[PDB]
Design an enzyme around this catalytic site. Structure first.
Site, mmCIF file in Angstrom:
data_model
loop_
_atom_site.group_PDB
_atom_site.id
_atom_site.type_symbol
_atom_site.label_atom_id
_atom_site.label_comp_id
_atom_site.label_asym_id
_atom_site.label_seq_id
_atom_site.Cartn_x
_atom_site.Cartn_y
_atom_site.Cartn_z
ATOM 1 N N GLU A 1 28.222 -12.724 16.427
ATOM 2 C CA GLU A 1 28.369 -13.313 17.750
ATOM 3 C C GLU A 1 27.072 -13.938 18.236
ATOM 4 O O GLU A 1 27.088 -15.036 18.797
ATOM 5 C CB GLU A 1 28.851 -12.257 18.734
ATOM 6 N N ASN B 1 3.498 -6.518 21.613
ATOM 7 C CA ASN B 1 2.952 -5.197 21.862
ATOM 8 C C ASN B 1 2.393 -5.032 23.253
ATOM 9 O O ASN B 1 2.467 -3.936 23.808
ATOM 10 C CB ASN B 1 1.845 -4.875 20.860
ATOM 11 N N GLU C 1 0.843 -1.189 0.000
ATOM 12 C CA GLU C 1 0.000 0.000 0.000
ATOM 13 C C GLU C 1 0.881 1.243 0.000
ATOM 14 O O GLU C 1 1.749 1.383 0.866
ATOM 15 C CB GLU C 1 -0.951 0.007 1.201
ATOM 16 N N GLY D 1 -0.229 -9.130 6.235
ATOM 17 C CA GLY D 1 -0.062 -9.955 5.058
ATOM 18 C C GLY D 1 1.206 -9.619 4.310
ATOM 19 O O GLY D 1 1.883 -10.503 3.780
ATOM 20 N N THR D 2 1.541 -8.331 4.269
ATOM 21 C CA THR D 2 2.757 -7.909 3.589
ATOM 22 C C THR D 2 3.993 -8.401 4.327
ATOM 23 O O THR D 2 4.841 -9.087 3.750
ATOM 24 C CB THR D 2 2.782 -6.391 3.467
#
Ligand SMILES: Nc1nc2c(ncn2[C@@H]2O[C@H](COP(=O)(O)OP(=O)(O)OP(=O)(O)O)[C@@H](O)[C@H]2O)c(=O)[nH]1
Ligand SMILES: Nc1nc2c(ncn2[C@@H]2O[C@H](COP(=O)(O)OP(=O)(O)OP(=O)(O)O)[C@@H](O)[C@H]2O)c(=O)[nH]1
Ligand SMILES: Nc1nc2c(ncn2[C@@H]2O[C@H](COP(=O)(O)OP(=O)(O)O)[C@@H](O)[C@H]2O)c(=O)[nH]1
Ligand SMILES: Nc1nc2c(ncn2[C@@H]2O[C@H](COP(=O)(O)OP(=O)(O)O)[C@@H](O)[C@H]2O)c(=O)[nH]1
Ligand SMILES: [Mg+2]
Ligand SMILES: [Mg+2]
Lengths: 93, 426, 96, 427, 426, 427
Positions: free
Chosen positions: D244, D196, D61, D134-135
């Site tokens: 590392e 989140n 988008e 979805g992207t």
């Protein structure tokens, strides 16, 4: 150090003075087109002035046969005012 | 430099020429009194192609009005841009033909065409480098068809190298004014196929349909129809009169649209054409002009081009435009409508760009397609001709003047072999 | 008739605006409205908002971040290759 | 040494929008792109007095992309990098993985190729994407696949956003998370989770911001990435590189899912009233009140941990603090990793961006650990995936795009196998 | 970039669309004459989705009006923001269907729908990247239902890969304006479930209840109902026109809300909606918007959701808001009323935020819920259909036109299995 | 050292109208004609403070020539130089070669003689023509053959414009292109093709100009011409004369058709953002995304390559870059040339034109190659020539003009022979 630095500074200066000229060029071309547009618009308005005076003359000569008339010959209330004015002028005559 | 001599014949030719010289004069900015009043330099350098500076800035058209009745001359002289022609160019008989091809081709031409040839000659050597002649006439009338056709023959006899345009209208049965339309039109076409260089076919049926559908006019008088045809003719010779990014003169178009010497009948379309109430509700882009060009409801003939194939096609554009958009749009229409084109010729689209738009518009276009749908129109005429000629209707008006029956049989033969060779290349 | 002043080359003069090849400070991406009309073009330069503004949060956060600019810092612990490793290699002997 | 950072999806490039903001604000670059050497790892210098970041923002988008094209950093970012599609994948893994990916990812690849060719000492890639969309899920995995086939041996640091257990915005994200994890397993070398709900709780309690938006989230996430790359930009007493984490943190080629944390998340006023030292932040790095993933390590066992240190830090007290941690018994390690720490010290403190609510701290710790609570998270996700899948809900969209039931069943059993792997290593 | 073509059918569609374009133009700052007069740069970036610049600041809406009687057309041209539609987009019959689904689908459709298809075709190729179509019509009338539904079928078989929203008012016993409401509704829904991607049911009863209780309007004319419907339509497509922290396009909403291809009937609500008398005593936060969103007396359908279960729901927020507050509010509203949601789908609520409020307010929202209680409305209409169809009432006006009886039995069967599967998933 | 340039046809003098504008801007010559020794090869110094170019415009239609006569460069060109006939050839090779050529060519070459007698150190001639038209083709070929019988040994560089495969403006252009080529084989020495579709793609792709016209095409064609003659004009580290292309690129007397390309073609914003160097422009000059002819040299094998480097170039990195190209396998050479390159370096960077779109660059590359992809091109044109000739279409124009089928059939089999030649040599 001095040579390379002054070369970079000069190149930045030239690029800037080029971008500004391109922008100014666009400004000038748009202004020129706008002048042409205003010219054509004013010309058309001038022609409309003449067509309006001619319509006024036709209405003046139509004012005599006021009672016998088709449905629409009065475009607006100002036209009605004009026809009443020329009617009174005929009455004076 | 290159010169275009104009010749108008008959009532239709005279009134078409009146609107034509009106719009050309507006393009070059010359007043109805004959003096220059334009603004741009560009309008000066190419007025010798159509005019002659006489004395005191009088630019007179290089035209010849020709008819047999003074009614058309007076209708021409009445309106504005009527007092700009040279009265010596008003070559004019006195008797009147009146829808009789025999009258206009054997009786009255015998005493008129000498004077017309004198005037057109003097008008020819008056200029230096002739490009060609440009004739506007009809195929229904008598003094237009017969006299104009004989003049075409005499001119092609004298000057065989110069080009030749003929804007001729053909009759249609849906708009049929006279009764002897087939008798005249068939004989004229028989002579046009062997004498003219190319004929841009017109008709009034398609014009009335255009002003109904697209223009949405209420009272479409002849003024608007002649306005469209004049816009067509200005579009076809804008290349000589103005410099462009790609130029295409008359001979250049002729060689790009005529693949066979007898295959020289075109149909024409003009764009953009929009109603006044919707003129400001639209864009002005090349795709928008192209959609309006390739619409079948926009040709100026009564022949649906989707009933046949295009042999070639040409698009003359006017205005400051991007050539890339021009060619990609041409590529799109050559690919999307791929079946409607002839197969054994790739790249069937000639294009050209002029840098000066017509007055009042920003960007316009003219389409000249050499299609094989024109054989429908000739069959549409030839079937009527055979219907009468099976039965010698009205024949004595032509027989008693000198014309014999073999002329009608020969006209049937050429009409039939033409539509058969169009049918072959379809 | 007398061309004292040479014709002003319309073919080049038409490029920057009449065909609109010049972008008014727009990136080669940026699918948006081009406003291909003079009134809209001249009205776009009177826009109060001018793109990034306190209206959208994504723009407002970056604006509040760059409000002060780059205040100050010390370059002690910044790793300098110019000191050690780019000092080994030098430029042309003769000079370029 | 250089590392390039690619951003896929709506959340990816927004985090990058905060990330590159912080980078220029650290290295003293104006938003237009010129200074008023440590930038070399992130910005390549074109000509002179001009810097262009090693990054590609790409999405389908164009709204958020041209928002970037027209934000403050029009001149900073480069025109070709900001790739934009024409229409969105719209929370559809298949639509992002087969329909539109096949047109956009080859352009992304031969872009990233000349980014690598412009680079010299490429350490690796690091990708930013949210698996809920979805992207970021679909073509993100497609890009990682083709990157693995292109280079393979180079590290790919994946910082992905997993969906929270209870706080959620999408409804098909369980499907998208499973299908993405199915490929993130065998492509990503080192993958860090960033939820989140955990950050929301951090902003609620510690930062005492009661109405936080995505801006504050992305800001502190960008802070962690900068704290994690500080070892490459700057010199410290004991530095690490990006390879590392490849060795010190991944015991088995399929167990690569790390719990991240940062300390101290402190507002501008609490710091004035509080004391900062190494011992308390070394503790505070382990409590779930400072983690970026909503899980409980009290239920799991640690595999290996990593500790990036920034600022004025001596090695004696970080050594003494980790010693006290190992002798404490509130947290327990696995029996197959006796030494379970990877330390690293860098001299520079974390800088602040104006407008943020992070205080200027003298020192900071970024912890990146491995545990089995991630096995608990995956099980909780797979359960609610199976709940929706038992009724064949929403499947018609994916098969309408062109997929089938085979990849659903094989992804389902793959996460079941991953569940068994976590349980058997935990014993 | 992403494009929405708008289609208005019948009297209900034309009046609603009229108020729709008024709200849209006022959000984009374009004056009713058709020139730009806004201030913010955000308004210019995304007018390609709804308008086309023609020339000189004139923006024309990308809409198509389609009906059969000019009374609606004059009501459109009379009111403000009426002179902006392109006159060619006024494709329009003359006779009038008049509450006859057969007249809307079999007799007059066969000559009007090819025309409107050509207009829609031209409007669709005028743009580059289609996002979907947006169709507003009614289900009771004839010229809206039958004609619009055939247009839906033709478009769906023409462009199968594009989204399509349809806003349809549905009949109710308390609002019974015409008499053949069930005979039209049942055939229309039968065709919509097989053609339309998703529909948003509307009715006049719920709107009147909204104007009674929440708005407390004195005289709720049709202008206010269309105002509410317009506010909803602007609210759903706000995402394509403005950027936000979490963008959710039309297709993203469809895939988040449609679990099965036949379960695509949503109930819609809008907040904030308070009387001007109480606007002074109220608060504007996310919880104050939510506890007005999830109220049953704010749905714009006559389907009490607490008599059923929610399958999925979606919320579109506009204005500068904190997403933590948004999401924890959705979590609380799903945990509290846990019985009213379906159990085998976790996280039943999709949420999205855009950073541009509507003009006149600081923060707004739009609720779209796919509940199962809609089967009450379908059962309510199918029972009236059965009551008429058992006895062949009013049937012959449909039978004698070309429609047969098995069409009605088919519509009954499909409605019955539709309400059966809603009840099944409940 | 001098080299004179002739321009034929509608396209030729529009190319010259942009090219000479570039020369005056490069040598600092004001359009009135005077500077406010390097110029000597293009301008001869008449009088005092006056330079008048070694050029000749000629056309049959006077409309575009007298557009030059009234343009900005009135005083710059000698009035006599600008030859112009009376009437156009009108897309007719026979008309422009037999009827009107016979009266115009003598005036032209009896001018060019006195131009050459004015000159002293003539390198050669270079011709600008488009073979699609009638003027560019007919008396173009007529001029070339009468120049070859007049001088013979002196090189004749032909920069021709061939018609695109799918993009087309005319209809008979296959007939004209074949009939022009039939003499272009054995008359010119070194012939460079340049198409219009390839340039349209270049300006749309790299220059992001969505609506280009012929002017932009002519602007960058002048860039190419100036970049390949700058070795004569200015002193570089490694100069290359016009006699060099005659040897170093033509291994066979009848295989002389050279593809051209240019790099970096770049906009005003992208150039400043990116870091221009020698390696990437050496790469970019080899992809078909930057060739002046719409053909894919991946299908062909390079016979020889020639690389003009302008500006900021040290020989080392160009040497290293051509090495990487040679060791890469994306492109291959014929087995005959192990040393398939010729480099050339000039110091002065390419200049910019106000109103031009190309930004100023430190360094640029103009590549002139030779391959068999051109062999694919001629077969493509031969196919659609046989299509129209099978039906005898448009032939009556040429025969009525005075020609016959003899040269039609022999030009057809001449292109057939050239096809066998390319296929034989490519093996
Ligand atoms: N922390 C954080 N998470 C975000 C942000 N923006 C979006 N997300 C998360 O991304 C998830 C959905 O994926 P998105 O990035 O929004 O959308 P996408 O991945 O681009 O896929 P599409 O919607 O099809 O474009 C949501 O569940 C959000 O939690 C952000 O700014 N910060
Ligand atoms: N690149 C480029 N090609 C051009 C230009 N002008 C014309 N052409 C090409 O020239 C071809 C046709 O020949 P023209 O140059 O237009 O006309 P001509 O060669 O002089 O032949 P005549 O028309 O008989 O005079 C077309 O196919 C164009 O592609 C130009 O300015 N730039
Ligand atoms: N478009 C157009 N057609 C015309 C005009 N005048 C006459 N015609 C057509 O010409 C035909 C009659 O031709 P006519 O005038 O009798 O030719 P003439 O008698 O030889 O001069 C009729 O079919 C008309 O339709 C005109 O001004 N415009
Ligand atoms: N809210 C609202 N409803 C309307 C309006 N006009 C008509 N309707 C509804 O449309 C239904 C009848 O459909 P009708 O208008 O006859 O459709 P048509 O004849 O096909 O155009 C009635 O139930 C009305 O409630 C309007 O302006 N506003
Ligand atoms: Mg997204
Ligand atoms: Mg020419």
């Amino acid at each position: 150090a001095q040579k390379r630095r002054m070369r970079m500074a000069e190149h930045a200066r030239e690029v800037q003075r080029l971008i500004d000229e391109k922008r100014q060029a666009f400004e000038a071309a748009k202004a020129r087109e706008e002048a042409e547009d205003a010219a054509k618009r004013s010309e058309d308005d001038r022609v409309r002035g003449l067509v309006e005076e001619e319509r006024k003359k036709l209405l003046r000569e139509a004012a005599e046969l006021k009672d016998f008339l088709p449905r629409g010959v009065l475009r607006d209330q100002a036209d009605v005012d004009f026809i009443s004015n020329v009617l009174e002028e005929m009455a004076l005559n | 430099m290159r010169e275009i001599v104009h010749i108008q014949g008959g009532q239709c030719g005279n009134q078409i020429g009146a609107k034509f010289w009106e719009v050309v004069s507006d393009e070059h900015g010359i007043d109805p009194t004959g003096t220059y009043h334009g603004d741009s330099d560009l309008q000066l350098e190419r007025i010798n192609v159509y005019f002659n500076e006489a004395t005191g800035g009088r630019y007179v058209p290089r035209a010849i009005l020709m008819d047999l009745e003074p009614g058309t001359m007076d209708s021409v002289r009445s309106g504005p841009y009527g007092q700009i022609f040279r009265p010596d160019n008003f070559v004019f008989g006195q008797t009147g033909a009146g829808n009789n091809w025999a009258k206009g081709h054997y009786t009255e031409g015998a005493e008129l065409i000498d004077s017309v040839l004198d005037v057109v000659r003097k008008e020819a050597e008056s200029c230096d480098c002739l490009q060609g002649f440009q004739v506007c006439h009809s195929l229904g009338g008598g003094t237009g068809s017969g006299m104009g056709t004989l003049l075409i023959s005499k001119i092609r006899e004298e000057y065989p190298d110069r080009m030749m345009l003929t804007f001729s209208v053909v009759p249609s049965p849906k708009v049929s004014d006279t009764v002897v339309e087939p008798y005249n039109a068939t004989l004229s076409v028989h002579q046009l196929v062997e004498n003219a260089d190319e004929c841009m076919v017109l008709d009034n049926e398609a014009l009335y349909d255009i002003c109904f559908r697209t223009l949405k006019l209420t009272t479409p008088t002849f003024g608007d129809l002649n306005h469209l045809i004049s816009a067509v003719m200005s579009g076809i010779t804008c290349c000589l009169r103005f410099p462009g990014q790609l130029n295409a003169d008359l001979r250049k178009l002729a060689v790009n649209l005529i693949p066979f010497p007898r295959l020289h009948f075109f149909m024409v379309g003009f764009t953009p054409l929009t109603s006044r109430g919707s003129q400001q509700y639209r864009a002005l882009t090349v795709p928008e002009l192209t959609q309006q060009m390739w619409d079948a409801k926009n040709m100026m003939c009564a022949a649906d081009p989707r009933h046949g194939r295009y042999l070639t096609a040409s698009a003359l554009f006017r205005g400051r435009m991007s050539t890339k958009e021009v060619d990609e749009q041409m590529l799109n229409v050559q690919n999307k409508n791929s079946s409607y084109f002839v197969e054994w010729i790739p790249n069937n689209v000639k294009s050209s760009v002029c840098d000066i738009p017509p007055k009042g518009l920003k960007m316009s276009a003219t389409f000249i397609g050499n299609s094989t749908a024109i054989q429908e129109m000739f069959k549409r005429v030839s079937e009527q001709f055979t219907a009468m000629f099976r039965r010698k209707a009205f024949l004595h008006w032509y027989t008693g003047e000198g014309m014999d029956e073999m002329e009608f049989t020969e006209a049937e033969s050429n009409m039939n072999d033409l539509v058969s060779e169009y049918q072959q290349y379809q | 008739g007398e061309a004292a002043e040479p014709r002003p080359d319309h073919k080049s003069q038409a490029l920057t605006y009449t065909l609109d090849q010049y972008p008014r400070g727009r990136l080669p991406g940026y699918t948006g409205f081009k406003a291909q009309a003079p009134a809209n073009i001249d009205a776009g330069l009177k826009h109060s908002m001018k793109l990034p503004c306190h209206s959208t949060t994504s723009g407002d956060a970056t604006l509040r971040g760059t409000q002060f600019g780059v205040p100050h810092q010390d370059h002690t612990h910044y790793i300098n290759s110019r000191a050690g490793l780019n000092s080994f290699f030098s430029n042309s002997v003769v000079g370029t | 040494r250089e590392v390039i950072s690619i951003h896929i999806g709506q959340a990816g490039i927004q985090v990058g929008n905060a990330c590159w903001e912080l980078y220029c604000l650290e290295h003293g670059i104006q938003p237009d792109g010129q200074m008023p050497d440590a930038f070399n790892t992130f910005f390549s210098e074109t000509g002179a007095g001009k810097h262009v970041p090693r990054c590609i923002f790409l999405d389908l988008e164009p709204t958020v992309v041209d928002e970037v094209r027209t934000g403050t950093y029009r001149q900073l970012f480069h025109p070709e990098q900001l790739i934009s599609g024409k229409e969105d994948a719209a929370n559809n893994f298949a639509r992002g993985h087969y329909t539109i990916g096949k047109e956009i990812v080859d352009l992304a690849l031969d872009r990233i190729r000349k980014l690598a060719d412009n680079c010299t000492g490429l350490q690796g890639f690091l990708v930013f994407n949210a698996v809920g969309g979805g992207t970021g899920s679909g073509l993100g995995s497609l890009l990682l696949e083709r990157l693995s086939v292109d280079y393979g041996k180079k590290s790919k640091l994946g910082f992905t956003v997993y969906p929270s257990p209870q706080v959620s915005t999408a409804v098909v994200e369980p499907y998208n998370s499973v299908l993405s994890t199915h490929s993130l397993l065998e492509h990503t070398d080192v993958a860090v989770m960033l939820d989140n709900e955990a950050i929301y709780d951090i902003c609620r309690r510690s930062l005492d911001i009661e109405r936080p938006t995505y801006t504050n989230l992305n800001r502190l996430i960008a802070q962690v990435i900068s704290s994690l790359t500080a070892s490459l930009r700057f010199d410290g007493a004991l530095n690490v590189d990006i390879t590392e984490f490849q060795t010190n943190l991944v015991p088995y080629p399929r167990i690569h899912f790390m719990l991240s944390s940062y300390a101290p998340i402190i507002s501008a006023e609490k710091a004035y009233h509080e004391q900062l030292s190494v011992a308390e932040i070394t503790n505070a790095a382990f409590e779930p009140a400072s983690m970026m993933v909503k899980c409980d390590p009290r239920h799991g066992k640690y595999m290996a941990c990593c500790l990036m240190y920034r600022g004025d830090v001596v090695p004696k007290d970080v050594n003494a603090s980790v010693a006290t941690i190992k002798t404490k018994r509130t947290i327990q390690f696995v029996d197959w990793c006796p030494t379970g720490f990877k330390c690293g010290i860098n001299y520079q403190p974390p800088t602040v961006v104006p407008g943020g609510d992070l205080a200027k701290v003298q020192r900071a710790v970024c912890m990146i650990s491995n545990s089995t609570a991630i096995g608990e998270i995956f099980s909780r996700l797979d359960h609610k995936f199976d709940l929706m899948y038992a009724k064949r809900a929403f499947v018609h969209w994916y098969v309408g795009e062109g997929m089938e039931e085979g990849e659903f069943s094989e992804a389902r059993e793959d996460l079941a196998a991953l569940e068994k792997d976590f349980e058997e290593v935990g014993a």
